[PDB]
């Protein structure tokens, strides 16, 4: 149903050129809008940003700062909901975004819920769509893909974590998984990890629980999983809030021996890493996606071609890392968001 990130870029060489060009623009110093818009642009954001994870909040912060440094006049309406919830608000806010004739509508997709909405925008409106936290183009939309898919590739991050656990434990190691809520994130972060680990190290999956994408749910799921399968050496978590909940569970059960990962490397995760509560995590160079979105909008306003997809990079972080390594990474990742 989805194109792999590299698979997409290899299939369409011109897309790889565009993506590489955006990547270079993101790292290079700000080159302000060459053509001033006579109307400030209207931007609407609908993000499942109400979480312990600071990804969404930092994304808007870095995004707005880059828009500022690029001299782009804009009006931004923001709506933050909780993941796996607030279905009504999400629906009402998305419709309101189109009603207000926004120039750019930014949101995410984890379920099939808003696909028809996307199709409507693409076929009958002038509103451009930016889909955050997804870097795998939807095949059914090959004839007309959204303006931009942006994020930190889930498959890559999960492969990096899988490689690490593969080196930390011997063949046939017992483990359990804590998924996100049912959907895309669980599929691309969870099943990717399970597949590689089982295929390359013959690890033995003991259980895999779907969650409600919250810390409380991660805690509840970890306890349930360990009650039925205490003989595991590690637990792979598919998201920040869930992993932090699992941490609390391990502490309560006195099972600090069990390794647990974070997924994303935001401030709460890094604090847990330095505390030793989280053993490892794949840290994304966070602000790069917010910056990429501002650059993409800039190119659009300059009538330049914009890549269909853009994925930022990751850095593996462990509790054994020195404070200098952590500080150096924060300097890179939160250069704009602070
Ligand atoms: C961005 C994000 O994807 C799922 C969820 O929304 C999240 O915030 O949790 B995460 O930090 O693990 O990454
Ligand atoms: Ca269509």
């Amino acid at each position: 149903g989805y194109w792999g990130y590299q698979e997409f870029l290899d299939e369409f060489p011109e897309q790889r050129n565009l993506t590489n060009a955006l990547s270079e623009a993101v790292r290079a110093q700000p080159v302000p809008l060459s053509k001033p818009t006579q109307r400030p642009i209207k931007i609407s954001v609908v993000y499942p940003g109400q979480q312990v994870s600071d990804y969404w909040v930092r994304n808007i912060a870095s995004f707005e700062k880059r828009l500022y440094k690029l001299n782009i006049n804009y009006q931004l309406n923001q709506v933050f909901t909780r993941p796996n919830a607030d279905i009504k608000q999400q629906s009402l806010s998305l419709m309101e975004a189109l009603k207000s004739k926004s120039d750019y509508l930014i949101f995410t997709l984890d379920t099939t819920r808003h696909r028809k909405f996307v199709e409507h925008v693409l076929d009958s409106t002038n509103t451009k769509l930016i889909l955050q936290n997804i870097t795998t183009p939807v095949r059914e939309w090959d004839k007309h893909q959204p303006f931009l898919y942006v994020g930190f590739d889930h498959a890559e991050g999960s492969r990096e974590l899988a490689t690490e656990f593969g080196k930390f434990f011997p063949k046939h190691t017992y483990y359990s998984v804590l998924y996100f809520s049912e959907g895309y994130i669980s599929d691309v972060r969870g099943d990717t990890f399970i597949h590689q680990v089982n295929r390359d190290n013959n690890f033995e999956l003991q259980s895999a629980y779907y969650t409600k994408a919250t810390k409380q749910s991660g805690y509840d799921a970890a306890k349930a999983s360990l009650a039925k399968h205490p003989d595991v050496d590690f637990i792979y978590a598919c998201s920040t809030d869930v992993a932090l909940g699992a941490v609390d569970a391990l502490a309560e059960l006195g099972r600090e021996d069990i390794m647990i990962n974070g997924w994303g490397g935001g401030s709460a995760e890094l604090d847990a890493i330095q505390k030793g509560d989280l053993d490892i995590t794949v840290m994304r160079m966070n602000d790069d996606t917010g910056i990429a979105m501002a650059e993409a909008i800039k190119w659009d306003l300059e009538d330049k071609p914009v890549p269909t997809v853009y994925s930022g990079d990751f850095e593996i972080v462990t509790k054994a890392d020195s404070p200098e390594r952590i500080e150096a990474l924060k300097k890179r990742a939160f250069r704009y968001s602070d």
Side-chain angles (χ1 to χ4, degrees):
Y2 301 88
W3 283 91
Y5 181 70
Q6 291 299 327
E7 172 182 29
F8 179 84
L9 296 181
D10 284 326
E11 193 54 278
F12 309 94
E14 178 55 19
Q15 285 304 314
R16 187 179 288 288
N17 287 315
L18 289 173
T19 295
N20 290 335
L22 211 199
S23 297
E24 301 182 2
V26 167
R27 295 288 271 150
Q29 291 298 304
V31 175
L33 183 63
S34 65
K35 299 187 176 183
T37 66
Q38 306 194 160
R39 265 198 187 187
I41 62 176
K42 294 170 294 184
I43 304 170
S44 291
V45 173
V46 184
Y47 279 173
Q50 194 177 318
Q51 309 177 24
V52 173
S53 177
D54 57 5
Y55 182 76
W56 311 88
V57 177
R58 284 183 177 287
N59 180 262
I60 296 305
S62 58
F63 176 53
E64 286 192 286
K65 188 171 181 177
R66 193 67 171 203
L67 284 174
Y68 185 73
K69 295 187 176 282
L70 293 177
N71 193 241
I72 295 174
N73 298 314
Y74 71 91
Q75 171 183 173
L76 181 284
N77 180 288
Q78 183 184 126
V79 175
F80 269 30
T81 63
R82 289 166 299 168
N84 194 216
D86 300 333
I87 294 180
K88 188 181 66 176
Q89 188 57 241
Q90 199 172 185
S91 177
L92 304 183
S93 296
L94 287 174
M95 285 303 278
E96 181 58 61
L98 297 191
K99 297 176 62 180
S100 59
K101 297 90 170 187
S102 297
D103 296 295
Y104 303 87
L105 202 194
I106 313 180
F107 60 110
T108 194
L109 292 113
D110 188 57
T111 305
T112 39
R113 183 170 279 79
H114 312 123
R115 316 262 282 195
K116 286 189 176 182
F117 174 72
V118 172
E119 300 176 5
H120 174 240
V121 177
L122 296 175
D123 305 322
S124 341
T125 82
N126 292 59
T127 300
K128 300 201 177 67
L129 301 174
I130 296 173
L131 301 183
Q132 183 67 235
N133 209 31
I134 171 172
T135 53
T136 58
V138 177
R139 292 174 185 287
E140 48 180 288
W141 296 335
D142 284 329
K143 299 302 179 182
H144 192 180
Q145 290 287 4
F147 175 66
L148 178 69
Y149 288 86
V150 59
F152 291 84
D153 195 63
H154 306 292
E156 173 59 24
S158 299
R159 280 197 297 274
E160 286 183 33
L161 283 169
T163 298
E164 232 49 51
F165 282 77
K167 293 184 295 187
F168 298 163
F169 301 94
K171 309 289 186 176
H172 295 290
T173 285
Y174 280 32
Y175 74 106
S176 285
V177 170
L178 298 181
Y179 286 128
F180 194 57
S181 43
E182 295 188 62
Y184 173 75
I185 296 295
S186 284
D187 292 349
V188 298
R189 284 188 186 174
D191 299 325
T192 292
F193 181 89
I194 292 169
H195 182 254
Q196 187 178 308
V197 134
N198 291 186
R199 178 257 302 179
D200 296 336
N201 324 261
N202 297 318
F203 284 0
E204 307 288 352
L205 179 62
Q206 303 305 297
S207 68
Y209 289 63
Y210 282 100
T211 62
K212 296 181 175 301
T214 63
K215 183 177 181 184
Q216 182 59 53
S217 186
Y219 165 76
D220 292 331
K223 289 183 64 178
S225 178
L226 291 168
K228 279 54 188 177
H229 302 287
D231 58 351
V232 292
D233 294 330
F234 76 85
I235 290 175
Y236 173 70
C238 292
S239 65
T240 296
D241 293 34
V242 167
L244 295 174
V247 166
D248 288 347
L250 292 180
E252 181 180 305
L253 296 179
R255 289 304 301 288
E256 293 73 21
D257 60 297
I258 298 177
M259 190 174 141
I260 178 73
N261 65 291
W263 213 116
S267 294
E269 287 197 5
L270 296 178
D271 285 351
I273 289 287
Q274 296 192 293
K275 275 264 189 176
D277 295 325
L278 224 39
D279 297 282
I280 181 180
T281 188
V282 68
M283 177 183 186
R284 49 215 164 191
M285 296 301 94
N286 196 87
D287 292 355
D288 285 353
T289 48
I291 289 171
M293 305 164 80
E295 290 295 353
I297 286 179
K298 190 189 75 189
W299 285 356
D300 189 39
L301 295 172
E302 302 177 326
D303 290 342
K304 294 180 179 178
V306 176
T308 294
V309 71
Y310 171 82
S311 174
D313 297 309
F314 303 91
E315 288 283 51
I316 285 292
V317 172
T318 76
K319 56 176 179 183
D321 284 314
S322 64
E324 280 73 14
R325 174 54 186 297
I326 300 298
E327 185 54 47
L329 291 175
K330 288 181 182 175
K331 227 58 184 178
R332 253 250 70 212
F334 317 137
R335 48 170 168 160
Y336 274 32
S337 56
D338 255 338

